[PDB]
């Protein structure tokens, strides 16, 4: 029996005036599979915000998002706990539709994190909007991805810069698994292959 639960995104309805996923609102994402709206994850979430009586977000509770398979809007991640090497909280995210876009441009934005891999092992479609992945000083694998297989509209482009050097990534063992096709990988394991050779 397959069940699907739709929930409001950040900025919409129950989260009308929220800036980010935070300690107070994150419980309301439990069992959600489809986000009708956007998800913002900002630095505010982690240091807390007394002005809104919002305490700091416990990083373990991000794992609530593991049930999200779809996002109609965009995914913006601008802060993430250091001790997490990837975005496994979104390891089951399949689709980002991008009906709404950040700055009217981006459907997926991963900025200034310390991750070493994206880990979006389940991502199969970014229907609209651009992808920006910059400033992640330790992030490898991002350049291997064949984004054209994931896009859906015409002028979708990427902006992937100022991450970990490909040479430094290849120098270390951080390269797609030998079972991965030339379509890239989200990480070093076969589960992280976009497609298997």
């Amino acid at each position: 029996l397959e069940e699907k639960k739709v929930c409001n995104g950040i900025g919409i309805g129950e989260f009308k005036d929220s800036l980010s996923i935070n300690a107070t609102n994150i419980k309301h994402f439990k069992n959600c599979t489809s986000i009708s709206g956007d998800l913002h994850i900002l630095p505010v979430a982690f240091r807390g915000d007394s002005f809104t009586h919002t305490p700091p977000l416990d990083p373990q509770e991000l794992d609530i998002l593991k049930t999200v398979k779809e996002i109609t809007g965009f995914l913006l991640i601008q802060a993430w706990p250091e001790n997490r090497t990837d975005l496994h909280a979104f390891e089951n995210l399949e689709i980002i539709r991008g009906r709404t876009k950040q700055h009217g441009q981006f459907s997926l934005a991963v900025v200034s994190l310390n991750i070493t891999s994206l880990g979006l092992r389940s991502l199969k479609e970014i229907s609209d909007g651009d992808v920006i992945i910059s400033g992640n000083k330790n992030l490898c694998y991002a350049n291997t991805i064949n984004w054209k297989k994931l896009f859906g509209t015409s002028g979708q482009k990427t902006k992937i810069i100022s991450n970990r050097g490909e040479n430094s990534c290849k120098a270390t063992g951080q390269v797609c698994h030998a079972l991965c096709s030339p379509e890239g990988c989200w990480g070093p394991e076969p589960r992280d292959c976009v497609s298997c050779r």
Partner: nanobody
Amino acid sequence: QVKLEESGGGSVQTGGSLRLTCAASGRTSRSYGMGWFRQAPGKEREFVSGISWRGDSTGYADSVKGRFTISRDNAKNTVDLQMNSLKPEDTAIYYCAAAAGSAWYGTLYEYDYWGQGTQVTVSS
């Protein structure tokens, strides 16, 4: 829920002064500590100056201590950065930033909203 726009940049001669402004729009009627950053080609984005919501607390990087002055006008919803005695070593794209809360921060990792940036070129 805050959009930021930098202005006041362009070309300047060494020894000259220049005043950058950051205009905020959107949900502006809550606490934001505001910061100024800059990114020179090749180099990574560094902190320049920061100011608290109230405007009573301010910070400056050592490279600009004495020469730069930050201020804000919460009524106009603006943040100015007065740059004097400019040097070629100040050439960079200057970014304005906001961090939800009262305090400013000296790292880029605490700021929730960023501007597009303005180029500031300093020549002999």
